[PDB]
Amino acid sequence: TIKEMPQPKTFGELKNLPLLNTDKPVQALMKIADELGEIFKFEAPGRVTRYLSSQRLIKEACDESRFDKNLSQALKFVRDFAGDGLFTSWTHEKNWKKAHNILLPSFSQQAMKGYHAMMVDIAVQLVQKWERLNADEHIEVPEDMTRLTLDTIGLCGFNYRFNSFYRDQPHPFITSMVRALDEAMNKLQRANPDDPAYDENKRQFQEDIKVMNDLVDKIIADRKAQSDDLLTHMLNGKDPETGEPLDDENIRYQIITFLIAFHETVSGWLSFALYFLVKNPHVLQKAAEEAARVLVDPVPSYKQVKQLKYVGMVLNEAIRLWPTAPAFSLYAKEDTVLGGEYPLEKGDELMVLIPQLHRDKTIWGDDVEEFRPERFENPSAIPQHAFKPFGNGQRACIGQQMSLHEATLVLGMMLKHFDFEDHTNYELDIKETLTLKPEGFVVKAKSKKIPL
Amino acid sequence: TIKEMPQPKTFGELKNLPLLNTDKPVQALMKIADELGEIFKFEAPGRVTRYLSSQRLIKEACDESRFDKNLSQALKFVRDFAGDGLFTSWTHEKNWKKAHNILLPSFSQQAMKGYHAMMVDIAVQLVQKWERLNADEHIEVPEDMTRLTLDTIGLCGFNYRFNSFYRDQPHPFITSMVRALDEAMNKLQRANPDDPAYDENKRQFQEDIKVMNDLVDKIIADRKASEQSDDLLTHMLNGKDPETGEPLDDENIRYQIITFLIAFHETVSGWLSFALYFLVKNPHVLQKAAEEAARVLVDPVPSYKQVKQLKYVGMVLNEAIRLWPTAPAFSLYAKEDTVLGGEYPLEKGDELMVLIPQLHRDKTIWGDDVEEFRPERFENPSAIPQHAFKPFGNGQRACIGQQMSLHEATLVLGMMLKHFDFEDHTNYELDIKETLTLKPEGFVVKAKSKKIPLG
Amino acid sequence: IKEMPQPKTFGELKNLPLLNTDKPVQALMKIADELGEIFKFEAPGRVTRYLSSQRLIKEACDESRFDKNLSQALKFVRDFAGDGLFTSWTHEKNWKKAHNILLPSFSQQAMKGYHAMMVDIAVQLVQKWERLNADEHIEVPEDMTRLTLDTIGLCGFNYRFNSFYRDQPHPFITSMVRALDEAMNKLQRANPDDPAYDENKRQFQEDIKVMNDLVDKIIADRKASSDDLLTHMLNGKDPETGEPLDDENIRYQIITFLIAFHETVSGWLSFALYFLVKNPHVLQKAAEEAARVLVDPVPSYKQVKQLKYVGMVLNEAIRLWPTAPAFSLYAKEDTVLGGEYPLEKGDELMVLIPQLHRDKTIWGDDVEEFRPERFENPSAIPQHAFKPFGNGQRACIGQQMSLHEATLVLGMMLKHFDFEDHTNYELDIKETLTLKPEGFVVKAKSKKIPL
Amino acid sequence: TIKEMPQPKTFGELKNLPLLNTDKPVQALMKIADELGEIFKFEAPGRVTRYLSSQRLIKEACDESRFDKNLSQALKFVRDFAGDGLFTSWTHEKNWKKAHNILLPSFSQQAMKGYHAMMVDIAVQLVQKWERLNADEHIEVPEDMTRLTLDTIGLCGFNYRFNSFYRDQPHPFITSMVRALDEAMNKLQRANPDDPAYDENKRQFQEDIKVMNDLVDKIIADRKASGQSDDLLTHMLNGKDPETGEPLDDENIRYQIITFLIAFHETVSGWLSFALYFLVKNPHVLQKAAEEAARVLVDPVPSYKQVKQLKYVGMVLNEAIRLWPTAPAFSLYAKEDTVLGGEYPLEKGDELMVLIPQLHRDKTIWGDDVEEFRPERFENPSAIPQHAFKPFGNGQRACIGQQMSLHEATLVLGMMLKHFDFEDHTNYELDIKETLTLKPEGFVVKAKSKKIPL
Numbered sequence A: 001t002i003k004e005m006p007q008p009k010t011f012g013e014l015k016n017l018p019l020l021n022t023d024k025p026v027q028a029l030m031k032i033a034d035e036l037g038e039i040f041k042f043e044a045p046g047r048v049t050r051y052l053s054s055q056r057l058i059k060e061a062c063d064e065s066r067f068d069k070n071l072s073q074a075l076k077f078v079r080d081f082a083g084d085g086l087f088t089s090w091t092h093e094k095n096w097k098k099a100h101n102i103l104l105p106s107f108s109q110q111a112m113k114g115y116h117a118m119m120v121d122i123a124v125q126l127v128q129k130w131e132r133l134n135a136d137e138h139i140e141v142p143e144d145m146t147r148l149t150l151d152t153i154g155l156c157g158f159n160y161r162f163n164s165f166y167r168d169q170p171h172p173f174i175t176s177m178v179r180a181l182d183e184a185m186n187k188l189q190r191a192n193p194d195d196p197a198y199d200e201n202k203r204q205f206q207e208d209i210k211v212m213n214d215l216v217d218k219i220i221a222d223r224k225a226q227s228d229d230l231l232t233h234m235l236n237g238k239d240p241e242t243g244e245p246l247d248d249e250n251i252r253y254q255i256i257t258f259l260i261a262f263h264e265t266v267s268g269w270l271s272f273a274l275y276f277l278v279k280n281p282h283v284l285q286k287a288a289e290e291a292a293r294v295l296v297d298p299v300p301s302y303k304q305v306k307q308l309k310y311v312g313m314v315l316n317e318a319i320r321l322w323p324t325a326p327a328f329s330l331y332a333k334e335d336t337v338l339g340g341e342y343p344l345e346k347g348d349e350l351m352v353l354i355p356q357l358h359r360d361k362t363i364w365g366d367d368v369e370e371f372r373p374e375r376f377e378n379p380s381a382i383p384q385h386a387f388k389p390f391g392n393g394q395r396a397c398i399g400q401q402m403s404l405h406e407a408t409l410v411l412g413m414m415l416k417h418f419d420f421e422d423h424t425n426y427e428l429d430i431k432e433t434l435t436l437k438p439e440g441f442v443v444k445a446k447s448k449k450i451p452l
Numbered sequence B: 001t002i003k004e005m006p007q008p009k010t011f012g013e014l015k016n017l018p019l020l021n022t023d024k025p026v027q028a029l030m031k032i033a034d035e036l037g038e039i040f041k042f043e044a045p046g047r048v049t050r051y052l053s054s055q056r057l058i059k060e061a062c063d064e065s066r067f068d069k070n071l072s073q074a075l076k077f078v079r080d081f082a083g084d085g086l087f088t089s090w091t092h093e094k095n096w097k098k099a100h101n102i103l104l105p106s107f108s109q110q111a112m113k114g115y116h117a118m119m120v121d122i123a124v125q126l127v128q129k130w131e132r133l134n135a136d137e138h139i140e141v142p143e144d145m146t147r148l149t150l151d152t153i154g155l156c157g158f159n160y161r162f163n164s165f166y167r168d169q170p171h172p173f174i175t176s177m178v179r180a181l182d183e184a185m186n187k188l189q190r191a192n193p194d195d196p197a198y199d200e201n202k203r204q205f206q207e208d209i210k211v212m213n214d215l216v217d218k219i220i221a222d223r224k225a226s227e228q229s230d231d232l233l234t235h236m237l238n239g240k241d242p243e244t245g246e247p248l249d250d251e252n253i254r255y256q257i258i259t260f261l262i263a264f265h266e267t268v269s270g271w272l273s274f275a276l277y278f279l280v281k282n283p284h285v286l287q288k289a290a291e292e293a294a295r296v297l298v299d300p301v302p303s304y305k306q307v308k309q310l311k312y313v314g315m316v317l318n319e320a321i322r323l324w325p326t327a328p329a330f331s332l333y334a335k336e337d338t339v340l341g342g343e344y345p346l347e348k349g350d351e352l353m354v355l356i357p358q359l360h361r362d363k364t365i366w367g368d369d370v371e372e373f374r375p376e377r378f379e380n381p382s383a384i385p386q387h388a389f390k391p392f393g394n395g396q397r398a399c400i401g402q403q404m405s406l407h408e409a410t411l412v413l414g415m416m417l418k419h420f421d422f423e424d425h426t427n428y429e430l431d432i433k434e435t436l437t438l439k440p441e442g443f444v445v446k447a448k449s450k451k452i453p454l455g
Numbered sequence C: 001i002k003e004m005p006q007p008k009t010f011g012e013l014k015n016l017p018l019l020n021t022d023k024p025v026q027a028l029m030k031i032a033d034e035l036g037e038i039f040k041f042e043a044p045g046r047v048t049r050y051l052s053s054q055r056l057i058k059e060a061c062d063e064s065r066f067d068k069n070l071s072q073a074l075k076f077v078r079d080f081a082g083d084g085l086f087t088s089w090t091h092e093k094n095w096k097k098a099h100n101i102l103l104p105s106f107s108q109q110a111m112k113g114y115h116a117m118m119v120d121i122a123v124q125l126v127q128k129w130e131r132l133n134a135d136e137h138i139e140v141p142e143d144m145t146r147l148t149l150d151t152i153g154l155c156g157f158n159y160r161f162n163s164f165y166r167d168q169p170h171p172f173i174t175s176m177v178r179a180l181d182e183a184m185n186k187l188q189r190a191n192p193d194d195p196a197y198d199e200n201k202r203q204f205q206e207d208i209k210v211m212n213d214l215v216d217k218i219i220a221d222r223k224a225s226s227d228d229l230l231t232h233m234l235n236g237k238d239p240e241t242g243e244p245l246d247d248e249n250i251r252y253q254i255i256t257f258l259i260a261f262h263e264t265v266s267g268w269l270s271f272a273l274y275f276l277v278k279n280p281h282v283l284q285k286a287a288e289e290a291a292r293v294l295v296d297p298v299p300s301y302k303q304v305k306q307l308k309y310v311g312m313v314l315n316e317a318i319r320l321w322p323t324a325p326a327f328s329l330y331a332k333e334d335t336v337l338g339g340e341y342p343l344e345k346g347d348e349l350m351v352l353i354p355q356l357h358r359d360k361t362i363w364g365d366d367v368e369e370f371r372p373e374r375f376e377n378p379s380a381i382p383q384h385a386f387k388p389f390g391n392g393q394r395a396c397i398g399q400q401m402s403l404h405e406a407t408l409v410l411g412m413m414l415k416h417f418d419f420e421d422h423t424n425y426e427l428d429i430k431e432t433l434t435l436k437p438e439g440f441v442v443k444a445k446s447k448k449i450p451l
Numbered sequence D: 001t002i003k004e005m006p007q008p009k010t011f012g013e014l015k016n017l018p019l020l021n022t023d024k025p026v027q028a029l030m031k032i033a034d035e036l037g038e039i040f041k042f043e044a045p046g047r048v049t050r051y052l053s054s055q056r057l058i059k060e061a062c063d064e065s066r067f068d069k070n071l072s073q074a075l076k077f078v079r080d081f082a083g084d085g086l087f088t089s090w091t092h093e094k095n096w097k098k099a100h101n102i103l104l105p106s107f108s109q110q111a112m113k114g115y116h117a118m119m120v121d122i123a124v125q126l127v128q129k130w131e132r133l134n135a136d137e138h139i140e141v142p143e144d145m146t147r148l149t150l151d152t153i154g155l156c157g158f159n160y161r162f163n164s165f166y167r168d169q170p171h172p173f174i175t176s177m178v179r180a181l182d183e184a185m186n187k188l189q190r191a192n193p194d195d196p197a198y199d200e201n202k203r204q205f206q207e208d209i210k211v212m213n214d215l216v217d218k219i220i221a222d223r224k225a226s227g228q229s230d231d232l233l234t235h236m237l238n239g240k241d242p243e244t245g246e247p248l249d250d251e252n253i254r255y256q257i258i259t260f261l262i263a264f265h266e267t268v269s270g271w272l273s274f275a276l277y278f279l280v281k282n283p284h285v286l287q288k289a290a291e292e293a294a295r296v297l298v299d300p301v302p303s304y305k306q307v308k309q310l311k312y313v314g315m316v317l318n319e320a321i322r323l324w325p326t327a328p329a330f331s332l333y334a335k336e337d338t339v340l341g342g343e344y345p346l347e348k349g350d351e352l353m354v355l356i357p358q359l360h361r362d363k364t365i366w367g368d369d370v371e372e373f374r375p376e377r378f379e380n381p382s383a384i385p386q387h388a389f390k391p392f393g394n395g396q397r398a399c400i401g402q403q404m405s406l407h408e409a410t411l412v413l414g415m416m417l418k419h420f421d422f423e424d425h426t427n428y429e430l431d432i433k434e435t436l437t438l439k440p441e442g443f444v445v446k447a448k449s450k451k452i453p454l
């Protein structure tokens, strides 16, 4: 011990729990970090956690020999419909390392080449929908990104077609997922989960899990009707220590896991980029420039997607400022001291506020709020563990290459084919589920009249 | 001659445990037993045991003068909620032989005739439900068998009505109970029962045992109040052991009540469920039993006598329990130092595991056509070799409810054949749910009512 | 400081039945995958530990702690390869002796003289493929065996095997290949005295006679009417003890060199060519490099050192399937390996090179993909992560020579032909003690470039 | 199964107190443990505790995320003269962490090398004393062990010479300390702290704290009269807490000395006395032990390295403290509400008592030969289950002095076998003296010198 850790305003037996009684919890934790600094204690009725925001402390917390991935209270609630899936499993749980080693092949750079084609299929549907709009209309950006990202993960991953672009009120599954995800966040604020007022909520949630298990558990049977896809790797892959493939119910947990994490992270990710592009018109220019120069075929090639360097940089700079999955949690593998100042008991919890990490002024310089993609011209100059939008270590985001490819591909095609107007002067408003997307974001797009 | 025993792949300090890190250990120990042969050593961190697969070795192990019933690690974990009840007590502990002797009267034939009435009650309810289904509806068999057996044991044993058929969601008591058995199973494989993944499991486990104890304490209240009662339960209360004179302490009563509920409802559901599977997949066998049904059940409701007629139905049930004994294994320890089968020396106290499924697949005893389902193997039961067919355990520690069960399945299985035709409308691939017991999972059928009325 | 994993045990026969296959090395890889970076492998009367991670492999290559061990495998090769360079103890008298007598033959200096005869053999192969009719095809490992054997026989010993003038394999190659087949098979044998194996032993005894009768033929053809590997054996004297090699040891070095070269380099070329037809972008990328640099009818020593992508292809092939897949080490004194595994002095280690070359922590998550671009900055490669040629003073003396031969040959093949995997060949790895693809066939269309 | 806790007979408003109105409670609680099994509740007027006997439950009770060290009612009374010394302080008491991180350097293996020389000196005095005995004279083992352990802790700890071997009548200092412990233990057992029967006690107790504080301030003053030793005492005067203050205040130091002196001389002597008991009672072991001493103690005086090489001797000592842990118990409280062993709910703050002697007798862990003295159990010390053997406590509050004590027991016991043959000439029946620590009462032997010189 040397240093007593700061802690924000406390409400008697309710601790600092009321501090996140916003619809914007993450943003509130930022507002607290901005005033209390690199670390602060955050107490709830049944739990206590420490939030880290400086690259200095995060570098220590990302030591895989001292800390492991913890299930935050948030992820504990997602465990009720995502169960034992990669995102919500403990490292030492039996299905993590099992599922982790079988699936890494399906997201290696080699796997992308196969996903590329179906990736494009959904990508044209989006382009066609925008081309077919009449002039007086506009684009509802998050909604169309959700349509795309879900149809892409559903098609490329499992060869199931959601056909979101053929419907206006969202898919029952997606509406159920979002309402299930919303319930997980809504619980965080209940200091009385037994209270009867939450019976309709507990009812609806239970009905929503049935909706997901319905479609998904049908899909596992609907394929036993084999191609080379994510589901086939799950049905056919073998674990070398017991020799068994994945549990039938565990697969149901992974599919649910992959559908949500992809559709929620990637759609938010694309939306944020587009905001920054229409708000930074010169960056928009140079980005459409490379887009026009590289996207030389009626359809993109896998090689060409890699040859977008500035579109990728806008993507990196977007996820820096608003990382769509804003936080991960860790626990102390053993007793240890953090930053030489804060001692930790075995089992103590840490929360990394990725947005606040990504604003650490000593690391990125004093223009941390400016959208300047050229910070990524020399990616090796960026310090180890200063930029962790995909988590850390073995528990790092398994789909970051799939995601980058999709975002790069789609963003490239958008820049080739349209010019974008911030016709309403949209002020950035962040919707918070557990993930982050912008809300009501709308643009108008004038077609560059180019065929596919 | 004194030959060393095979042992499968071993890891670090955690020994052979990762080999059995599945949701279907018995099916895995089988696929291991098939690989290593009749006997192999299986070490887990801090415990050592031998798994047996040949009748040759089992005949030696069923000598009650050399081996006594041992509590497997599995049973040590169910003892966490079944305590020293009949299933999970040491045969030398005081409460075993006390309870064994006070309760044994309640399961001989003479007692069965008394239960027959309420057994039919619960069965008519099942048939009544299957009659009352709409045309394109289906039957979830394991789930409806679960409703049946729990309703049957609780009424015959305890004059308590679960009224499971009056529910869609399983009785909450069953939900907790199944998760408790599932937890005992999972605790077997835990590579580190410490680290935090397992803290909610601790929560759930205790929460579920409390659930079971409450309705048990409600059954005991329901009787302190409600009667001319020839029960498992009256023999438990008023019954006195004729050797030391006293009756059961309350705690042991509670463990016996839970014990009886669980074992009946789990093994007997699995049995009937499997029986239907093999019948629907071998239709001439279904035909053969389906006429024994029509031929013997000539009154609107079966009589006790009619159940013993159904010889083939018993034969069907036997061949099913042979293939998948729902209690797939029992454990033994060496009373003293010995050599097993002349090849393997063992120190006193070494534990043995009988993989009843693997015994029941022995080719030297059953022939080369084992895995085929032919109920005709059980027609001269005296022709069946001694110690080759042990689905009901062994010796004085054998299943006390064997005849009650055989009577139960045959009656229920008989009526099902009398009143319905069964369609495997899904071409169901067999999926064995493994708690500690076995039973088919997701098994569904369609049933055509033969439109015969009931009483 | 922890206990080591171990595969399935069969009582008194220990782990021995696990390698009662025809492909033990590939079988040790499957075991490694289930048990990880280290596992104990016991047979009755023998114990060894298999290592798979660069983390532990870096330790086992510390030459102050561990020395080259003769695995049970090499001990059987010693029955016809004796005290030759490969099957010698580091302390044996003839090792250090022969090492210094022979090292002059593998310096860069020596290579430049060999290049002329190396080209000779390569032209024979090209002439043979060009002279094929349209419907015909190439049996790849067989033609690589014709090449490599003729090549070392020419450079090392100025002896012409004239393999390309034959349809039936060379008798030497047959006896020699089953001598390795027997050495490998003797390893898994539970009952070595049984009448089942009596015919194998007459046959083994006969294979050694065939090999020695040819070696005796080579020496007389020289002692007839040349600054080569053989003269250095006959005339060279050890600067440390003063004497040349005994006649006995000469026989073993000749046998050793013919076998080691022809077997490892046959496998290498075949695997390289295998990967080339399976990754056609690499085929194209490498195909052009030949045309750009190999501009004269026959390559110059300098030109081959310029074929860099080709060299990279070759390196990426020996990374995936190292033709000598293992070497063994023993602990010089009591020690602890990796802070986890205490070792008494004399305990044996086995380096499973194919599994080492798959350590993702070093090579990344795409280890199984054939990507020669990993070897652009070879200095970027961590030490002890890429060890196809062994380690330290006991490392392969014929290393740079092989790379030269493989590159010379691989380039000319790319210069002069286009190859079709007309069979969609599935990779089948034959195992003696070395590795080799077995049923590999392709078609080649001549580019009509003359020689 | 979430079980009702057994509890022995309760006597009116006096609860279970009449059950321990004996002179040997630990020995009695073992008897209770045997009838009621692995756990029972024990209530006294104002106290409730749960006594644990099984490895099953102890494995849970030593989880430091659930339980913290409690001041047992005993330790609450010892605190009356040990104050906030290391033994009788709460973990959250400021001075505990302060003293712990300041003093831990004095028990590192780095430190034993320094203590070894002075440890030997006291040990030689013991050898010389036994050698210079006349033929009829026998040896009273515990009394000599006390002389040894106290002279050694004072010399190593504080560079102060008690010179106990120059006395036959006990130190005024030690009799006061021994009587203070005996009183704290007995004041635990009294129904009425009001009765006039206890006035002489209340007089003597307050008088004995007076002597202890006297002698201790002499030690703290005698070093000022010197200014140069690198010992426990210099570490207390010079060590500063790396946490927020600098040095140890002069009052807590007054308590660390009392704590160390008492903790060493009572546990470490009783341990040695016990080690000798089993050796004279199991001659096969003694033969084996002398064997090892004769081979290893190859210098006229033993060296620090040689001591490490005395394995079997370490085995017997470990086997002795297993059978009779001289500090027989420690106490724990619940940091929050929890369930113990899945059966017994505990409210936050509820107290537990670990009966180290009964745990070291758990058949499931050690086998059915619990009572027989077989030092061969400890040749694979890493094979022994975790938390089945806790003679030096548990966790952050485990005995700081294990390293040193074992160094003493090995050193002293080793020479005894080097230089003497031992006869239980009286056929001594084991009688266990119980203060808060344990110790044989009246153990006597005769020793024949092997005539080996130094």
Ligand code: FDE
Binding pocket: A069, A086, A087, A088, A100, A257, A258, A261, A262, A265, A266, A269, A324, A325, A327, A328, A329, A389, A390, A391, A392, A394, A395, A396, A397, A398, A399, A400, A403
């Ligand atoms: C499919 C997919 C897609 C995606 C995307 C994404 C984006 C854009 C972003 C992101 C992120 C992330 N992730 Fe992500 N993702 C995914 C996924 C995933 C999974 C499965 C996971 C888990 C793995 C492990 O760790 O185990 C993740 C994971 C992840 C993470 C971590 C978590 C924790 O808690 O630690 C993060 C931070 N992810 N992400």
Ligand code: FDE
Binding pocket: B069, B070, B086, B087, B088, B259, B260, B263, B264, B267, B268, B271, B326, B327, B328, B329, B330, B331, B390, B391, B392, B393, B394, B396, B397, B398, B399, B400, B401, B402, B405
């Ligand atoms: C009620 C009931 C019913 C039944 C059924 C049955 C079926 C179906 C099958 C069976 C089985 C069996 N069991 Fe059975 N069961 C019963 C029961 C029982 C009991 C109580 C027991 C224990 C007994 C004694 O002896 O104690 C049994 C028991 C039994 C056994 C053995 C166990 C041991 O561990 O040894 C077996 C194997 N079971 N099981």
Ligand code: FDE
Binding pocket: C068, C085, C086, C087, C088, C256, C257, C260, C261, C264, C265, C268, C323, C324, C326, C327, C328, C387, C388, C389, C390, C391, C393, C394, C395, C396, C397, C398, C399, C402
């Ligand atoms: C001639 C020749 C050729 C060759 C080639 C080759 C290839 C391709 C690959 C290889 C390899 C090798 N090698 Fe080799 N090679 C040779 C050789 C040799 C010799 C002689 C040896 C031994 C040396 C010494 O040191 O002694 C070798 C050696 C060698 C090795 C080592 C082994 C042990 O045991 O350790 C290895 C790993 N190799 N290799």
Ligand code: FDE
Binding pocket: D069, D086, D087, D100, D259, D260, D263, D264, D267, D268, D271, D326, D327, D328, D329, D330, D331, D390, D391, D392, D393, D394, D396, D397, D398, D399, D400, D401, D402, D405
């Ligand atoms: C000097 C010294 C010496 C010694 C020794 C001994 C022997 C022989 C035995 C013993 C023991 C013991 N400890 Fe002992 N010791 C000592 C000490 C001590 C101290 C200071 C303590 C407290 C610590 C803390 O941190 O808290 C102890 C501590 C101790 C313990 C714990 C108890 C409680 O409270 O928990 C035990 C059981 N110890 N011990």
